[PDB]
Amino acid sequence: TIKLIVGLANPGAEYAATRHNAGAWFVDLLAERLRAPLREEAKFFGYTSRVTLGGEDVRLLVPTTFMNLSGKAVAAMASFFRINPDEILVAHDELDLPPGVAKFKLGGGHGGHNGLKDIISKLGNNPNFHRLRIGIGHPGDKNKVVGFVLGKPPVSEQKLIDEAIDEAARCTEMWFTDGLTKATNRLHAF
Amino acid sequence: SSGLVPRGSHVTIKLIVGLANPGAEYAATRHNAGAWFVDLLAERLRAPLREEAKFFGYTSRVTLGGEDVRLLVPTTFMNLSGKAVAAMASFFRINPDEILVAHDELDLPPGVAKFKLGGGHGGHNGLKDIISKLGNNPNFHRLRIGIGHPGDKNKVVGFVLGKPPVSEQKLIDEAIDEAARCTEMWFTDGLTKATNRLHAF
Amino acid sequence: TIKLIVGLANPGAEYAATRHNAGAWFVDLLAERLRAPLREEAKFFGYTSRVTLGGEDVRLLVPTTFMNLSGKAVAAMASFFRINPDEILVAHDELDLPPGVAKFKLGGGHGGHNGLKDIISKLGNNPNFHRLRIGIGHPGDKNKVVGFVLGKPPVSEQKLIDEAIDEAARCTEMWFTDGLTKATNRLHAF
């Protein structure tokens, strides 16, 4: 069960469009579709919101700490509400998967992503939280990497990431009902 | 866009309900036409709907001709719309003839919208439930947003629960705009309105 | 330096979509991107919000006074916070520039726009505040003008105004971060 969903990013018009904000992209989609857009909450070093999913509180966060210090916010908020690492879902860009693919995982490696690195550290050195890996691709040589994650993707790629993010978001909504509630409802929908 | 009763002593609207089904699943479909409308109003009036479990939907408060008007979109699912409408209306002691209920309409085509007081539920289950749950009283205002007919009485469910093509959407959005611009005028009086346009330049 | 940004418009569902609200369109975009949408504040006769730009308070206002009396609100607020005219930025529709163009200026003529007229007057007769001129175009003859500004533009034009507004808002926000905060961020941004 999930009590907090964190979308990793760097704040600012400067970065808003870049590949590193993929996580935010996802949480902002969720947020908008669930009708509670993230507003500033300095107490947790990001922008936050509260929704209700399957009749329980789920909280959304996008840290305004900058990728490096994501940990700070994630830690802050999770302790305030006494949420365990395995109840946290962290959405991030992923160089290992391609545009148009997204995947879930519990724990495991930080795969070179500094936002994750810090979250492991600041969560008392515990990598056992859920990740949503939003595929962005590899630039080819290990050199062009920083410019690549801190770069805006071409329309063709954006088209593909948006689709993966949509589907991921769609699935998220659906976690919170069981097949028998989900059929109880189609008979009410019409 | 035509057909509200003219304003007066009472006559007057305290609650606007935009009928729909909740979920990304249905957000886009023809049945959410009502919500589409209320959301447009809400956004233009700068008070987007936020969750309020007390009334089983999303709600917001706006100010129109200096009077509280409240907006509701039920998260109950079309079938049980009544539950929410009823809940809210009793809490605020609002009468049926002060409720305006916006819905998709198979009788009118994309691009047309019309107002009505009372009368038939025209097969729409959302309305059916509201009449029932309001102590069996169909005397509330409706905004009929035209969506069209799929032809045969069979493909109907898929049609209302379907997303419309861009050509149709374009047309529904225009009607909804106009309606939302319209409702606005209905609350205003003839003299303040004109005087406002005068200052609006 | 800028302490208050005003986006000129008329309130109501009636006008929300019209060419006169171009100012509001801009401030609302800023506001939304900065995650502090404008809420009602009767004290200043409009909707207002507070953001933080380059670590200083910037305030956003969209007067609910109606174009004609825009001054009233601009004046009220600016005095409450002791803001000078050259620290006010005022975004308005411009019949001199076309759709898809936007431009900044300090002071100068009111160019027929009544909203600016009243602001000059109500600011103790002082035209020395900054303007963002969002281009909306000319209807041709000096007659159809009122219907034109109080009209909704066709999609083709809207598409173009939104692009200019976006750009303006991207620039506006970024002209606020200094090089030392900019540089300090990239350090953390990857």
Q: How many secondary structure helices (H) and strands (E) does chain B include?
A: 6, 7
User: Is B114:B1 a contact under the CB 8 Å cutoff?
Assistant: yes
B55 burial via Cβ count (<10 Å: 0-12, 13-18, 19+): buried
d(CA C80, CA C114): 24
Q: Is B196 on the interface with C (CB under 8 A)?
A: yes
* Nearest residue in A to C51, CA atom: A40
User: Is A44:A99 a contact under the CB 8 Å cutoff?
Assistant: no
Structural biology method used = X-ray
User: Is A59:A48 a contact under the CB 8 Å cutoff?
Assistant: yes
> At a CB cut-off of 8 Å and minimum separation 6, what does A126 contact?
A85, A120
d(CA B112, CA B92): 32
Q: Is B119 left (phi over 0), alpha (psi -120 to 50) or beta?
A: left
User: Which residue in the set A13, A39, A68 is minimally distant from C173, CB to CB?
Assistant: A13
Q: Phi and psi for B15 in degrees, rounded to 5? A: -140, 130
> At a CB cut-off of 8 Å and minimum separation 6, what does B129 contact?
B78, B79, B80, B81, B82, B83
C40 contacts on B by Cβ (under 8 Å): 46
Chain centroid to Cα C37, Å, comes to 14
DSSP letter string, C133-149: EEE----SSTTTHHHHH
| Residues 156-185 (B) with a CB less than 8 A from some CB of C | 177, 180-181, 183-185
d(CA C162, CA C101): 10
Which of A8, A32, A48, A68 best tests the C interface by mutation, with the highest count of C CBs <10 A? A68
Dihedral of the CA atoms A175, A178, A183, A187 (nearest 10)? Answer: -80
Dihedral of the CA atoms C76, C79, C85, C89 (nearest 10)? Answer: -50
d(CA C119, CA B111): 40
A49: three-class secondary structure by DSSP: strand
Q: Is B67 on the interface with A (CB under 8 A)?
A: no
Q: Interior CA angle at C117 toward C113 and C121, to 5°?
A: 175
d(CA B91, CA C140): 54
* Nearest residue in C to B64, CA atom: C12
Q: CA nearest B21: which of B91, B156, B99, B124? A: B124
Looking at the DSSP assignment, which residues form a beta bridge with residue A56? A53
Resolution in Å equals: 3.2
Q: Is A189 on the interface with B (CB under 8 A)?
A: yes
> At a CB cut-off of 8 Å and minimum separation 6, what does B169 contact?
B110
Structure tokens at C168: 């303006």
B5: three-class secondary structure by DSSP: coil
d(CA C51, CA C59): 6
Q: CA nearest C82: which of C65, C46, C104, C57? A: C57
Side chain identity at residue C70, one-letter code: S
Catalytic option among C20, C92, C113, C130: C20
Q: Is A47 on the interface with C (CB under 8 A)?
A: yes
d(CA A30, CA A60): 9
User: Which residue in the set A51, A169, A189 is minimally distant from B77, CB to CB?
Assistant: A189
d(CA B74, CA B200): 35
DSSP letter string, A18-45: SGGGHHHHHHHHHHHHTT---EEEGGGT
For tokens 């506001």, the residue is: C31
C33 contacts on A by Cβ (under 8 Å): 13, 16
For tokens 């529904």, the residue is: B172
Sheet hosting strand B67-74, strand order edge to edge: B50-52, B57-64, B67-74, B15-18, B99-105, B141-146, B113-117
Looking at the DSSP assignment, which residues form a beta bridge with residue B135? none
Strands (E), B44-84: 50-52, 57-64, 67-74
Q: How many CB pairs under 8 A join A and C?
A: 46
Contact C189 A15 (CB under 8 A): yes
C138 burial via Cβ count (<10 Å: 0-12, 13-18, 19+): middle
Q: CA nearest A112: which of A78, A148, A77? A: A148
Any chains having at least 3 CB pairs less than 8 A from chain A are B, C
Q: Residues C159-185, buried b or exposed e (16+ Cβ, 10 A)?
A: ebbeebbeebbbebbeebbeeeeeeeb
For tokens 């819905």, the residue is: B103
**In CATH, what number is assigned to the domain containing residue C44?**
3.40.50.1470
C109: three-class secondary structure by DSSP: coil
Q: Phi and psi for B177 in degrees, rounded to 5? A: -55, -60
User: Which residue in the set A51, A170, A190 is minimally distant from B24, CB to CB?
Assistant: A170
- A157 CB neighbour count, 10 Å cutoff: 16
Number of domains in chain B: 1
User: Is B34:B45 a contact under the CB 8 Å cutoff?
Assistant: no
Structure tokens at C169: 């808002």
- Long-range contacts for B83-86 (Cβ within 8 Å, ≥24 apart)? B83/B56, B83/B129, B83/B133, B84/B17, B84/B55, B84/B56, B84/B57, B85/B17, B85/B130, B85/B133, B85/B134, B86/B130, B86/B133, B86/B134
Q: Residues B134-172, buried b or exposed e (16+ Cβ, 10 A)?
A: beeebebbbbbbbbbebeeeeeeeebbbeebeeebeebb
Chain centroid to Cα C95, Å, comes to 15
Structure tokens at C173: 């926000």
Contact C188 A68 (CB under 8 A): yes
For tokens 């990001």, the residue is: A46
d(CA A108, CA A150): 24
| Residues 123-142 (B) with a CB less than 8 A from some CB of C | none
B74 burial via Cβ count (<10 Å: 0-12, 13-18, 19+): buried
Residue span of the structural domain in which B117 resides: 1-201
d(CA C70, CA C88): 13
Q: Is B47 on the interface with A (CB under 8 A)?
A: no
Active site residue C138: no
User: Is B145:B179 a contact under the CB 8 Å cutoff?
Assistant: yes
Q: Is A53 on the interface with B (CB under 8 A)?
A: no
d(CA B174, CA C17): 12
Identify the helix (H) or strand (E) that includes residue B117: strand B113-117
